[PDB]
Coordinates of C-alpha atoms and ligand atoms in Angstrom, one line a residue:
Chain C
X1 CA 0.0 0.0 0.0
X2 CA 1.1 3.5 -0.8
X3 CA 3.3 5.0 -3.6
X4 CA 6.3 7.1 -3.0
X5 CA 9.0 8.9 -5.1
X6 CA 11.6 6.3 -4.0
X7 CA 15.4 6.5 -4.6
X8 CA 17.7 3.5 -4.7
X9 CA 19.6 2.8 -1.3
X10 CA 22.7 5.0 -1.7
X11 CA 25.3 3.1 0.4
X12 CA 27.1 1.6 -2.6
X13 CA 27.5 5.1 -4.0
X14 CA 28.5 6.8 -0.7
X15 CA 31.5 4.4 -0.5
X16 CA 32.7 5.9 -3.8
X17 CA 32.4 9.6 -3.0
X18 CA 35.7 11.6 -2.6
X19 CA 36.7 15.2 -2.6
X20 CA 38.7 16.6 -5.4
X21 CA 40.6 19.9 -5.1
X22 CA 42.5 21.6 -7.8
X23 CA 44.0 24.9 -6.9
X24 CA 41.2 26.7 -5.0
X25 CA 38.3 24.7 -6.6
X26 CA 36.8 21.9 -4.6
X27 CA 34.1 19.4 -6.0
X28 CA 33.1 15.8 -5.7
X29 CA 34.7 12.8 -7.4
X30 CA 33.7 9.2 -7.9
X31 CA 36.3 6.6 -6.9
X32 CA 35.9 3.3 -8.6
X33 CA 38.8 0.8 -8.7
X34 CA 42.0 2.9 -9.0
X35 CA 40.3 5.8 -10.9
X36 CA 38.7 9.0 -9.7
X37 CA 36.1 10.6 -12.0
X38 CA 35.2 14.3 -11.6
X39 CA 34.0 17.3 -13.8
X40 CA 36.9 18.7 -15.7
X41 CA 35.9 22.2 -14.6
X42 CA 37.7 21.5 -11.3
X43 CA 40.9 22.9 -13.0
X44 CA 39.1 26.2 -13.6
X45 CA 39.1 29.4 -11.6
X46 CA 35.6 31.1 -11.7
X47 CA 37.3 33.6 -14.2
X48 CA 38.4 30.6 -16.5
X49 CA 34.8 29.4 -16.6
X50 CA 33.7 32.3 -18.8
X51 CA 35.5 30.9 -21.9
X52 CA 37.8 28.0 -20.8
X53 CA 40.3 26.2 -23.0
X54 CA 40.5 23.0 -21.0
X55 CA 43.4 21.5 -23.0
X56 CA 45.5 24.6 -22.4
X57 CA 44.4 24.7 -18.7
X58 CA 45.3 21.1 -18.1
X59 CA 48.9 21.6 -19.5
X60 CA 49.6 23.7 -16.4
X61 CA 48.4 20.8 -14.1
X62 CA 50.4 17.9 -12.8
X63 CA 49.3 14.8 -10.8
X64 CA 50.4 16.5 -7.6
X65 CA 48.0 19.5 -8.2
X66 CA 44.9 17.2 -7.9
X67 CA 44.2 16.7 -4.2
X68 CA 41.9 13.6 -3.7
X69 CA 40.6 13.0 -0.2
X70 CA 38.5 9.9 0.7
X71 CA 36.9 10.6 4.0
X72 CA 39.9 11.9 5.9
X73 CA 42.7 10.1 4.0
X74 CA 44.7 11.4 1.0
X75 CA 44.9 9.3 -2.2
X76 CA 48.1 9.5 -4.2
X77 CA 47.4 10.6 -7.8
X78 CA 49.7 8.7 -10.3
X79 CA 48.0 9.8 -13.6
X80 CA 45.6 12.2 -15.1
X81 CA 43.7 12.5 -18.3
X82 CA 40.7 14.2 -19.8
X83 CA 37.9 12.2 -21.4
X84 CA 35.4 14.6 -22.9
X85 CA 34.2 16.8 -19.9
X86 CA 35.4 14.5 -17.1
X87 CA 38.9 14.1 -15.6
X88 CA 40.1 10.6 -14.7
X89 CA 42.6 10.6 -11.9
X90 CA 44.5 7.4 -11.6
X91 CA 45.3 6.8 -8.0
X92 CA 47.6 4.1 -6.5
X93 CA 44.9 2.5 -4.4
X94 CA 41.8 0.7 -5.7
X95 CA 38.7 1.7 -3.7
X96 CA 38.0 -1.2 -1.4
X97 CA 34.3 -0.2 -1.3
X98 CA 34.1 -0.4 -5.2
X99 CA 30.7 -2.0 -5.9
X100 CA 29.9 -4.0 -9.1
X101 CA 29.3 -1.2 -11.6
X102 CA 28.7 -0.1 -15.2
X103 CA 28.6 3.3 -16.9
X104 CA 25.4 3.8 -18.9
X105 CA 24.2 6.7 -21.1
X106 CA 20.5 7.0 -20.3
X107 CA 17.7 8.0 -22.6
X108 CA 15.4 11.1 -21.8
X109 CA 12.4 10.0 -19.8
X110 CA 14.5 7.4 -17.8
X111 CA 14.7 7.9 -14.0
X112 CA 17.7 7.7 -11.6
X113 CA 18.7 8.5 -8.0
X114 CA 21.1 11.3 -7.2
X115 CA 23.4 11.3 -4.3
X116 CA 23.9 15.0 -3.7
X117 CA 27.4 15.6 -2.2
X118 CA 29.5 18.5 -0.9
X119 CA 33.2 18.3 -0.2
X120 CA 33.1 14.5 -1.0
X121 CA 30.3 14.1 1.7
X122 CA 26.8 13.0 1.0
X123 CA 24.0 15.3 2.0
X124 CA 21.0 13.5 0.6
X125 CA 19.4 11.3 -2.0
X126 CA 16.5 11.9 -4.3
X127 CA 14.9 10.4 -7.4
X128 CA 15.2 12.4 -10.7
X129 CA 14.3 11.9 -14.4
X130 CA 16.4 13.0 -17.4
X131 CA 13.9 15.5 -19.0
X132 CA 13.2 15.2 -22.7
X133 CA 15.2 18.5 -23.1
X134 CA 18.2 16.7 -21.4
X135 CA 18.2 18.7 -18.2
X136 CA 17.4 17.4 -14.7
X137 CA 15.3 19.1 -12.1
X138 CA 17.6 18.5 -9.2
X139 CA 18.6 20.2 -5.9
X140 CA 22.2 21.3 -6.1
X141 CA 24.2 24.2 -4.8
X142 CA 27.8 25.4 -5.5
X143 CA 30.1 22.5 -4.5
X144 CA 27.6 19.8 -5.6
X145 CA 29.4 19.2 -8.9
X146 CA 30.7 15.7 -9.3
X147 CA 27.6 14.3 -7.5
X148 CA 26.4 11.3 -9.5
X149 CA 23.1 9.8 -10.8
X150 CA 22.6 6.0 -10.7
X151 CA 20.3 3.0 -10.9
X152 CA 20.9 -0.3 -9.1
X153 CA 20.2 -3.9 -10.5
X154 CA 20.5 -6.2 -7.4
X155 CA 24.2 -5.7 -6.7
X156 CA 25.3 -3.7 -9.8
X157 CA 25.4 0.1 -9.8
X158 CA 24.8 1.7 -13.2
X159 CA 26.2 5.2 -13.1
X160 CA 24.4 7.3 -15.6
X161 CA 24.9 11.0 -14.6
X162 CA 27.5 13.4 -13.1
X163 CA 26.4 16.8 -12.2
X164 CA 28.4 19.7 -13.9
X165 CA 26.2 22.9 -13.9
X166 CA 23.2 24.9 -13.2
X167 CA 21.6 26.8 -16.1
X168 CA 20.5 30.4 -15.5
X169 CA 16.9 28.9 -15.2
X170 CA 17.9 26.9 -12.1
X171 CA 17.7 23.6 -14.0
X172 CA 20.6 21.2 -14.0
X173 CA 22.9 19.9 -16.8
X174 CA 25.6 17.2 -16.7
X175 CA 27.3 14.3 -18.3
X176 CA 27.4 10.5 -18.5
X177 CA 30.5 8.9 -16.8
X178 CA 32.4 9.1 -20.2
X179 CA 32.1 12.9 -19.8
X180 CA 29.6 13.5 -22.7
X181 CA 26.9 16.0 -21.8
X182 CA 23.3 15.0 -22.0
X183 CA 21.8 17.6 -24.4
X184 CA 23.6 20.5 -26.1
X185 CA 25.2 21.9 -23.0
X186 CA 28.9 22.8 -22.8
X187 CA 30.9 23.3 -19.6
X188 CA 31.1 27.0 -19.9
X189 CA 29.6 29.9 -17.8
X190 CA 27.7 31.2 -20.8
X191 CA 23.9 31.5 -21.0
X192 CA 22.5 28.3 -22.3
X193 CA 18.8 28.1 -22.6
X194 CA 17.0 24.9 -22.4
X195 CA 14.5 23.7 -25.0
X196 CA 10.9 22.8 -24.3
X197 CA 10.4 20.5 -21.3
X198 CA 7.7 18.1 -22.5
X199 CA 5.9 15.6 -20.2
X200 CA 7.1 12.0 -20.3
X201 CA 3.7 10.5 -21.4
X202 CA 4.8 6.8 -20.9
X203 CA 5.8 7.7 -17.2
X204 CA 2.4 9.5 -16.6
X205 CA 0.6 6.4 -17.8
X206 CA 2.8 4.2 -15.6
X207 CA 1.9 6.4 -12.6
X208 CA -1.8 6.2 -13.5
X209 CA -1.5 2.3 -13.4
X210 CA 0.3 2.7 -10.0
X211 CA -2.6 4.9 -8.7
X212 CA -5.2 2.2 -9.9
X213 CA -3.1 -0.5 -8.1
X214 CA -3.1 1.6 -4.9
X215 CA -6.8 2.5 -4.8
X216 CA -7.0 5.9 -6.6
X217 CA -9.5 5.1 -9.4
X218 CA -11.7 8.2 -9.7
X219 CA -10.1 9.2 -13.0
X220 CA -11.0 5.8 -14.8
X221 CA -13.6 6.5 -17.5
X222 CA -16.0 4.8 -19.9
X223 CA -13.8 5.8 -22.9
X224 CA -11.0 4.5 -25.1
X225 CA -8.9 6.2 -27.8
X226 CA -6.3 5.3 -30.5
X227 CA -2.5 6.0 -30.6
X228 CA -3.1 8.8 -33.3
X229 CA -6.1 10.3 -31.4
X230 CA -4.2 10.3 -28.1
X231 CA -1.1 11.9 -29.8
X232 CA -3.2 14.8 -31.1
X233 CA -4.0 15.6 -27.5
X234 CA -0.5 14.8 -26.3
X235 CA 0.9 17.3 -28.9
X236 CA -1.5 20.1 -27.7
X237 CA -0.4 19.5 -24.1
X238 CA 3.3 19.3 -24.8
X239 CA 3.4 15.6 -23.9
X240 CA 5.8 13.3 -25.7
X241 CA 4.2 11.3 -28.5
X242 CA 3.3 7.7 -27.3
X243 CA 4.6 4.9 -29.5
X244 CA 4.0 1.1 -29.7
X245 CA 7.3 0.7 -27.8
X246 CA 5.7 2.7 -24.9
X247 CA 2.5 0.6 -25.1
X248 CA 4.7 -2.6 -25.0
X249 CA 6.5 -1.5 -21.8
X250 CA 3.2 -0.7 -20.2
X251 CA 2.0 -4.3 -20.9
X252 CA 2.8 -5.8 -17.5
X253 CA 0.9 -2.9 -15.8
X254 CA -2.0 -3.3 -18.3
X255 CA -2.0 -7.1 -17.5
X256 CA -1.9 -6.7 -13.7
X257 CA -4.8 -4.2 -13.7
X258 CA -6.9 -5.5 -16.6
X259 CA -7.0 -2.0 -18.0
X260 CA -6.0 -1.9 -21.7
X261 CA -3.2 0.7 -22.4
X262 CA -5.4 2.7 -24.9
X263 CA -8.3 2.9 -22.2
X264 CA -5.7 4.4 -19.8
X265 CA -4.6 6.8 -22.6
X266 CA -8.3 7.9 -22.7
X267 CA -8.3 8.5 -18.9
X268 CA -5.2 10.6 -19.4
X269 CA -6.8 12.4 -22.4
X270 CA -9.8 13.4 -20.3
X271 CA -7.5 14.5 -17.4
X272 CA -5.5 16.7 -19.8
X273 CA -8.7 18.2 -21.2
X274 CA -10.6 18.8 -18.0
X275 CA -7.9 18.9 -15.3
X276 CA -8.1 17.2 -11.9
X277 CA -11.1 19.4 -10.7
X278 CA -9.5 20.0 -7.4
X279 CA -8.9 16.3 -6.8
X280 CA -5.6 14.4 -6.2
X281 CA -4.0 11.2 -7.6
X282 CA -1.5 9.5 -5.2
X283 CA -1.5 12.6 -3.1
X284 CA -0.5 14.7 -6.2
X285 CA -2.6 17.5 -7.7
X286 CA -0.7 17.3 -11.0
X287 CA 0.2 14.4 -13.4
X288 CA 3.5 12.9 -12.2
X289 CA 6.0 11.9 -14.9
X290 CA 9.1 10.9 -12.9
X291 CA 8.1 7.1 -12.5
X292 CA 9.0 4.8 -15.4
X293 CA 6.9 1.6 -16.0
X294 CA 9.9 -0.3 -14.6
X295 CA 9.8 1.9 -11.4
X296 CA 6.1 1.2 -10.9
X297 CA 6.6 -2.6 -11.3
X298 CA 9.7 -2.5 -9.0
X299 CA 7.9 -0.5 -6.2
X300 CA 4.5 -2.3 -6.5
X301 CA 6.3 -5.8 -6.3
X302 CA 9.1 -5.1 -3.8
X303 CA 12.2 -5.7 -5.8
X304 CA 15.4 -5.4 -3.6
Chain U
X1 CA 18.9 25.9 -7.2
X2 CA 16.0 23.5 -7.1
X3 CA 14.2 21.8 -4.1
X4 CA 13.5 18.2 -3.8
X5 CA 11.9 15.8 -1.3
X6 CA 15.4 14.5 -0.2
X7 CA 16.1 11.5 2.0
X8 CA 19.2 11.1 4.2
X9 CA 22.0 8.9 2.6
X10 CA 21.0 5.4 3.7
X11 CA 24.4 3.6 3.8
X12 CA 24.7 3.6 7.6
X13 CA 21.2 2.0 7.9
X14 CA 21.8 -0.5 5.1
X15 CA 24.7 -1.9 7.1
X16 CA 22.2 -2.7 9.9
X17 CA 19.5 -4.4 8.0
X18 CA 19.0 -8.2 8.7
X19 CA 16.4 -10.8 8.0
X20 CA 14.5 -12.3 11.0
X21 CA 12.5 -15.5 10.5
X22 CA 10.3 -17.1 13.2
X23 CA 8.5 -20.1 12.2
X24 CA 7.1 -19.3 8.7
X25 CA 7.1 -15.5 9.2
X26 CA 10.0 -13.4 7.8
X27 CA 10.5 -9.7 8.3
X28 CA 13.3 -7.2 8.7
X29 CA 15.4 -6.6 11.8
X30 CA 17.8 -3.8 12.8
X31 CA 21.2 -5.0 14.0
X32 CA 23.0 -2.5 16.3
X33 CA 25.8 -3.7 18.5
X34 CA 24.9 -7.2 19.7
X35 CA 21.1 -6.7 19.5
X36 CA 18.7 -7.3 16.8
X37 CA 15.4 -5.2 17.0
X38 CA 12.3 -6.3 15.1
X39 CA 8.5 -6.2 15.3
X40 CA 7.2 -8.7 17.9
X41 CA 4.6 -9.9 15.5
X42 CA 7.3 -12.0 13.8
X43 CA 6.3 -14.7 16.3
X44 CA 2.8 -14.7 14.9
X45 CA 1.1 -16.8 12.3
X46 CA -1.4 -14.8 10.2
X47 CA -4.1 -16.6 12.3
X48 CA -2.5 -15.5 15.6
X49 CA -2.6 -11.8 14.3
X50 CA -6.4 -11.7 14.7
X51 CA -6.2 -11.5 18.5
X52 CA -2.6 -12.3 19.7
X53 CA -1.4 -12.9 23.2
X54 CA 2.2 -12.0 22.6
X55 CA 3.3 -13.1 26.1
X56 CA 1.7 -16.5 25.7
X57 CA 3.1 -16.8 22.1
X58 CA 6.6 -15.9 23.2
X59 CA 6.6 -18.8 25.9
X60 CA 6.6 -21.3 23.0
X61 CA 9.7 -19.6 21.5
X62 CA 13.3 -20.3 22.2
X63 CA 16.5 -18.4 21.1
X64 CA 17.0 -21.1 18.4
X65 CA 13.6 -20.4 16.9
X66 CA 14.7 -16.9 15.8
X67 CA 16.7 -17.1 12.5
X68 CA 18.7 -14.0 12.0
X69 CA 20.5 -13.7 8.7
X70 CA 22.8 -10.7 7.9
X71 CA 23.4 -10.7 4.1
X72 CA 24.2 -14.4 3.7
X73 CA 25.6 -15.2 7.2
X74 CA 23.7 -16.6 10.1
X75 CA 23.9 -14.8 13.5
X76 CA 23.7 -16.9 16.7
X77 CA 20.8 -15.8 19.0
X78 CA 22.0 -16.0 22.7
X79 CA 19.0 -14.1 24.2
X80 CA 15.5 -12.8 23.5
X81 CA 13.2 -10.4 25.2
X82 CA 10.1 -8.4 24.4
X83 CA 10.1 -4.6 25.0
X84 CA 6.6 -3.2 24.3
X85 CA 5.9 -4.2 20.6
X86 CA 9.6 -5.0 19.6
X87 CA 11.7 -8.1 20.2
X88 CA 15.3 -7.7 21.1
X89 CA 17.4 -10.6 20.0
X90 CA 20.7 -10.7 21.6
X91 CA 23.3 -12.1 19.2
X92 CA 26.8 -13.3 20.0
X93 CA 28.4 -10.8 17.5
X94 CA 28.4 -7.0 17.5
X95 CA 27.5 -5.6 14.1
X96 CA 30.8 -4.3 12.7
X97 CA 28.9 -1.8 10.6
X98 CA 27.1 -0.3 13.7
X99 CA 27.1 3.4 13.1
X100 CA 26.9 6.0 15.9
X101 CA 23.2 5.9 16.9
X102 CA 20.4 7.0 19.2
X103 CA 16.8 6.0 19.6
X104 CA 14.4 9.0 19.5
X105 CA 10.7 9.2 19.8
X106 CA 9.7 11.9 17.3
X107 CA 6.8 14.4 17.5
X108 CA 4.1 14.5 14.9
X109 CA 5.0 16.9 12.1
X110 CA 8.7 15.8 12.2
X111 CA 10.2 14.2 9.1
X112 CA 12.5 11.2 8.5
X113 CA 13.8 8.9 5.9
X114 CA 12.6 5.3 5.5
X115 CA 14.7 2.5 4.2
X116 CA 12.1 0.1 2.8
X117 CA 13.4 -3.5 3.1
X118 CA 12.2 -7.0 2.2
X119 CA 13.9 -10.2 3.5
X120 CA 16.6 -8.0 5.2
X121 CA 17.5 -6.3 1.8
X122 CA 16.9 -2.7 1.0
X123 CA 14.7 -1.8 -1.9
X124 CA 14.5 2.0 -1.6
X125 CA 14.6 5.1 0.5
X126 CA 12.1 7.9 0.8
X127 CA 11.3 10.9 2.9
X128 CA 8.2 10.7 5.3
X129 CA 6.6 12.8 7.9
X130 CA 4.9 11.5 11.0
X131 CA 1.3 12.7 10.4
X132 CA -0.5 14.6 13.3
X133 CA -2.8 11.5 13.5
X134 CA 0.4 9.4 14.1
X135 CA 0.3 7.5 10.9
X136 CA 2.8 7.7 8.0
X137 CA 2.0 7.8 4.3
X138 CA 4.7 5.3 3.3
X139 CA 5.2 2.7 0.6
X140 CA 5.2 -0.7 2.1
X141 CA 4.1 -4.2 1.1
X142 CA 3.9 -7.5 3.0
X143 CA 7.5 -8.3 4.2
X144 CA 8.4 -4.6 4.8
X145 CA 7.8 -4.9 8.6
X146 CA 10.9 -4.0 10.5
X147 CA 11.9 -1.3 8.0
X148 CA 13.1 1.7 9.9
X149 CA 12.7 5.5 9.9
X150 CA 15.7 7.7 10.8
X151 CA 17.4 11.0 10.7
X152 CA 21.2 11.7 10.5
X153 CA 23.2 14.4 12.3
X154 CA 26.7 14.4 10.7
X155 CA 27.8 10.7 11.7
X156 CA 25.0 9.9 14.2
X157 CA 21.9 7.9 13.1
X158 CA 18.7 8.7 15.2
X159 CA 16.4 5.9 14.6
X160 CA 12.8 7.0 15.2
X161 CA 10.5 4.5 13.5
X162 CA 10.0 0.9 12.9
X163 CA 7.3 -0.3 10.5
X164 CA 4.7 -2.7 11.9
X165 CA 1.4 -2.4 10.0
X166 CA -0.8 -1.2 7.3
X167 CA -4.2 0.1 8.4
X168 CA -7.3 -0.9 6.2
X169 CA -7.0 2.6 4.6
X170 CA -3.5 1.9 3.2
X171 CA -1.8 4.2 5.7
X172 CA 1.1 3.0 7.9
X173 CA 1.6 2.6 11.6
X174 CA 4.5 1.6 13.7
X175 CA 6.6 2.1 16.7
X176 CA 9.7 4.0 18.0
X177 CA 12.8 1.7 18.7
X178 CA 11.6 1.1 22.2
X179 CA 8.5 -0.7 20.7
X180 CA 6.0 2.0 21.6
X181 CA 3.4 2.7 18.9
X182 CA 3.0 6.2 17.6
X183 CA -0.7 6.9 18.0
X184 CA -3.3 4.6 19.5
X185 CA -2.5 1.7 17.3
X186 CA -2.1 -1.9 18.5
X187 CA -0.2 -4.7 16.8
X188 CA -3.4 -6.7 16.0
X189 CA -5.2 -7.4 12.7
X190 CA -8.3 -5.6 13.8
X191 CA -9.7 -2.5 12.0
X192 CA -8.2 0.5 13.5
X193 CA -9.4 3.8 11.9
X194 CA -7.1 6.8 11.8
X195 CA -8.1 10.2 13.1
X196 CA -8.2 13.4 11.1
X197 CA -5.1 14.0 9.2
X198 CA -4.4 17.7 9.6
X199 CA -1.9 19.7 7.5
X200 CA 1.4 20.5 9.2
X201 CA 1.1 24.3 9.0
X202 CA 4.8 25.1 10.2
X203 CA 6.1 22.7 7.5
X204 CA 3.9 24.3 4.7
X205 CA 5.3 27.7 5.8
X206 CA 8.9 26.3 5.8
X207 CA 8.3 25.1 2.2
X208 CA 6.8 28.5 1.2
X209 CA 10.2 30.0 2.4
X210 CA 12.0 27.3 0.3
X211 CA 10.0 28.4 -2.7
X212 CA 10.8 32.1 -2.2
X213 CA 14.5 31.1 -1.8
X214 CA 14.4 29.2 -5.1
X215 CA 12.5 31.8 -7.2
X216 CA 8.8 30.8 -6.9
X217 CA 7.4 34.1 -5.6
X218 CA 4.0 34.5 -7.4
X219 CA 2.1 33.7 -4.1
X220 CA 3.7 36.6 -2.1
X221 CA 1.0 39.2 -1.4
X222 CA 0.5 42.7 0.0
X223 CA -1.0 41.4 3.2
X224 CA -0.2 40.4 6.7
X225 CA -2.3 38.7 9.5
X226 CA -2.1 37.8 13.2
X227 CA -1.5 34.4 14.9
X228 CA -5.2 34.4 16.0
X229 CA -6.5 35.5 12.5
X230 CA -4.4 32.9 10.7
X231 CA -5.5 30.2 13.1
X232 CA -9.2 30.8 12.4
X233 CA -8.3 30.1 8.7
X234 CA -6.1 27.1 9.7
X235 CA -8.9 25.6 11.7
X236 CA -11.4 25.8 8.7
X237 CA -8.9 24.2 6.4
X238 CA -7.8 21.4 8.9
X239 CA -4.3 22.9 9.3
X240 CA -2.5 22.6 12.7
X241 CA -2.8 25.7 14.8
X242 CA 0.4 27.8 14.5
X243 CA 2.1 28.7 17.9
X244 CA 4.9 31.2 18.8
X245 CA 7.2 28.1 19.0
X246 CA 6.5 27.5 15.3
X247 CA 7.1 31.2 14.5
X248 CA 10.4 30.9 16.4
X249 CA 11.6 27.9 14.4
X250 CA 10.7 29.8 11.1
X251 CA 13.0 32.7 12.3
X252 CA 16.1 31.7 10.3
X253 CA 14.0 31.4 7.2
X254 CA 12.3 34.7 7.9
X255 CA 15.7 36.3 8.4
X256 CA 17.3 34.9 5.3
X257 CA 14.3 36.0 3.0
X258 CA 13.4 39.2 4.8
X259 CA 9.8 38.0 4.8
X260 CA 8.2 38.3 8.3
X261 CA 6.6 35.0 9.5
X262 CA 3.1 36.6 9.8
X263 CA 3.4 38.1 6.2
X264 CA 4.1 34.4 5.0
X265 CA 1.1 33.3 7.1
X266 CA -1.0 35.9 5.1
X267 CA 0.3 34.4 1.8
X268 CA -0.7 30.9 3.1
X269 CA -4.1 32.3 4.2
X270 CA -4.8 33.6 0.6
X271 CA -3.6 30.3 -0.9
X272 CA -6.0 28.4 1.4
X273 CA -8.9 30.7 0.5
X274 CA -8.3 31.0 -3.2
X275 CA -6.4 27.9 -4.2
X276 CA -3.4 27.9 -6.5
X277 CA -5.5 28.9 -9.6
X278 CA -3.9 26.3 -11.8
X279 CA -0.4 27.4 -10.8
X280 CA 2.5 25.4 -9.1
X281 CA 4.9 26.1 -6.3
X282 CA 8.2 24.1 -6.4
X283 CA 6.6 22.0 -9.2
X284 CA 3.8 21.0 -6.8
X285 CA 0.0 21.9 -7.4
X286 CA -0.8 21.5 -3.7
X287 CA 0.7 22.9 -0.4
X288 CA 3.6 20.5 0.6
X289 CA 3.8 19.8 4.4
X290 CA 6.6 17.1 4.5
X291 CA 9.5 19.6 4.9
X292 CA 10.3 20.9 8.4
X293 CA 12.0 24.3 8.8
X294 CA 15.2 22.4 9.7
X295 CA 14.8 20.4 6.4
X296 CA 14.6 23.6 4.4
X297 CA 17.6 25.2 6.1
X298 CA 19.6 21.9 5.6
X299 CA 18.8 21.6 1.9
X300 CA 19.1 25.3 1.1
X301 CA 22.6 25.4 2.8
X302 CA 24.1 22.0 1.8
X303 CA 24.6 20.4 5.3
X304 CA 26.3 17.0 4.8
Ligands
LIG401 C1 26.5 27.1 -8.6 C2 26.0 25.7 -8.9 C3 24.8 25.2 -8.4 C4 24.3 24.0 -8.7 N1 24.9 23.2 -9.6 C5 26.1 23.6 -10.1 C6 26.6 24.8 -9.7 N2 27.9 25.2 -10.3 C7 28.0 25.7 -11.6 O1 27.1 25.8 -12.4 C8 29.4 26.2 -12.0 C9 29.7 27.6 -11.4 C10 29.6 26.1 -13.5 C11 29.4 27.2 -14.3 N3 29.5 27.2 -15.6 C12 29.8 26.0 -16.2 C13 30.0 24.8 -15.5 CL1 30.5 23.3 -16.3 C14 29.9 24.9 -14.1
LIG402 C1 0.6 -6.3 4.5 C2 1.5 -5.1 4.9 C3 1.7 -4.1 4.0 C4 2.4 -3.0 4.4 N1 2.8 -2.8 5.7 C5 2.6 -3.8 6.5 C6 2.0 -5.0 6.2 N2 1.7 -6.0 7.1 C7 0.7 -6.0 8.1 O1 0.0 -5.0 8.2 C8 0.6 -7.3 8.9 C9 -0.1 -8.4 8.2 C10 0.0 -6.9 10.3 C11 -1.4 -7.0 10.5 N3 -2.0 -6.6 11.7 C12 -1.2 -6.1 12.6 C13 0.2 -6.0 12.5 CL1 1.2 -5.5 13.8 C14 0.8 -6.4 11.3

C-alpha cells in the first residue's frame, strides 16, 4: 500500500564519494577501482569558466596538483587524463568499497537516483528523471558538482549521470560517466537556454497504473482512444508522442490491472482536457512523470 | 537551485538491515551492537494476528527459533526479550557496521527517511513525515515490517520509527525503537481507523520560504495577518494551529528572506482561501507539508 518517489539505497555510491581539489576549486569525485572521475571544470578558476580552454588549462596541471581525499585520507594521484568533460585521476589504491558497476548513457524519460554531495560528503538522496530537453530538475548548490546519478540492479550500480552545472533557469545539466553532456550543453559559464520541457507520457501512464493498483481510481472513465487520437491531445499539451514501444513497456501494468493501455490513454486524455477538478492522484494535484513503467513494477512488487 | 523531497543517505542504515525468521514468518530486523530489533509480530502466524497474546506466544519460542541472517551469514541468537511491541534478539556478534546511533521518539510533524526493506534487503529510500494523527504515508508491502525510519546528524543515526502495520486505509503505523506505537495503534489485525489527518502548518510555511529562496514568488502578497486571525483560517482548512514556538523555528527562514513570519502566514491564508489557480509552487500543485523548517535550512545550505 502507498506509492512514493523512492530512490535506490545509496550506500554503494556513498562508499565511492571523494573530494577533489585543484587549486582553490573543490568538488566531488567518484572513486571506482583505481580511478577517480570528476568534472573537468575542477581545473578552472571562476574567471576561467567564462571561456575555458580545458586543453590549455590542463597543460599547467600535474598529478600533484589534484588533491583527492576519501573521508579523511589522502589518495596518491599517479595519472591524469581528460575524457570529454570528465577528468580521470589514476590513484595508486583501488577503492576497497568499489561496488559492481557499469557506466550507462540513459535516454530522456528514464529515471535515476542522485546522491547530492558537498566536499566529498553525502547530504541526501533523491529520485530524478532525465527530462526530454536533457536537463534534470535536481537540488544542487555550489560544491555539488561531481555528484552522481545512478540506478541499481540487485548488486550492480549503473552510473548514468555526473552533475556539472546549473543553467540560469535553475535547472541542471551534466554528463554521463564518459564525460559526454546530456543535451547540447557545454561546460562554460555562458547562458545556455533549455528547450521545451515536454511531459514524459509513458511515465504519466505508468503512474496512472500505480494509482489504480493503490486504490485511486476516480479518473478511470468509460472511454477509449487510438494512438493517433491520443497523440493529437499529447501534442497540444506538450506531452511526448506515445509509440507502440511505450505501449509494449506498459504491458505488465495493463495485464496486472486488466486496464488496456489505450483505455488508460483515454483516462489521461480526459485528465488533460478537464484537469483534476481540485482532486488528487497518489497525493499529487498534477500528473507525475518521474516514474517509469519499470519503477512502478519494482515498487509495486518489492524488488530489492 | 532546485528543491527536492530529499532523504538522508541510507548507507549507515543498510549496514544494519538483517532478516528475521520465526517459524514461517519473515520480516526485517535492525542489528545495532549485539542486539537485533524487530516487530514482535514476527512470532505470529497470520491466524495469531487476529487476537494475539504475545506473552503466551513468546513462551513457546526459544533463542534457536529466531533465525537472524545478515546478508548471507547466520547470527547466533543468545537471548531474547520483548520490549513493548519489539523483540530484542541478543546475538553473539556485535555488528561491525554499527554506526553512531540514538533511539528517538519523534513528534508529529517531524520528518524522517525510511529505508524500505524485504527479507533484510533494502529496496529503496524515501522521505516521510509523522502525520499529526500518528500514521505515516509510506510505501510498504507484506514483508516490509521491521523497515526503519531515521534522521542523521553528521555521523549519528537517530532511529525514530520501525514499521509494523498497514491500516485498512492503506496508511502505515509503527513504533519507536523502544517498541511503543506512535498513536493509538495496537499490533493486531483488527480494524483501526485513523483520526483526522491535519496539515502540518509550520512545514507548509517552511516550504513557502524554500519556494521564495528558489525563485517561486507568485504567491507573495501585499497582506499580513495575526496568529489568531491565521489560526481561524487554519482551523477551517484542517491545518494545525500555529504557535509562537512554530514562528520561532521559522525565524532563520524569515531572516534569510526578509519576509516576516506573519506576512508568510497571510500568503498561506490567501492560498488556502483562493487555491493555486492552476499554478504550481516548487513543481507542486498543492501545499507540501513534509519539509520541516530544519529540512529547508539543511537543503538550502548543503549540510552533509
Ligand atoms: C552554482 C551551482 C549550483 C548548482 N549546480 C552547479 C553549480 N555550479 C556551476 O554551475 C558552476 C559555477 C559552473 C558554471 N558554468 C559551467 C560549469 Cl560546467 C559549471
Ligand atoms: C501487508 C502489509 C503491507 C504494508 N505494511 C505492513 C503490512 N503487514 C501488516 O500489516 C501485517 C499483516 C500486520 C497486521 N496486523 C497487525 C500487524 Cl502489527 C501487522
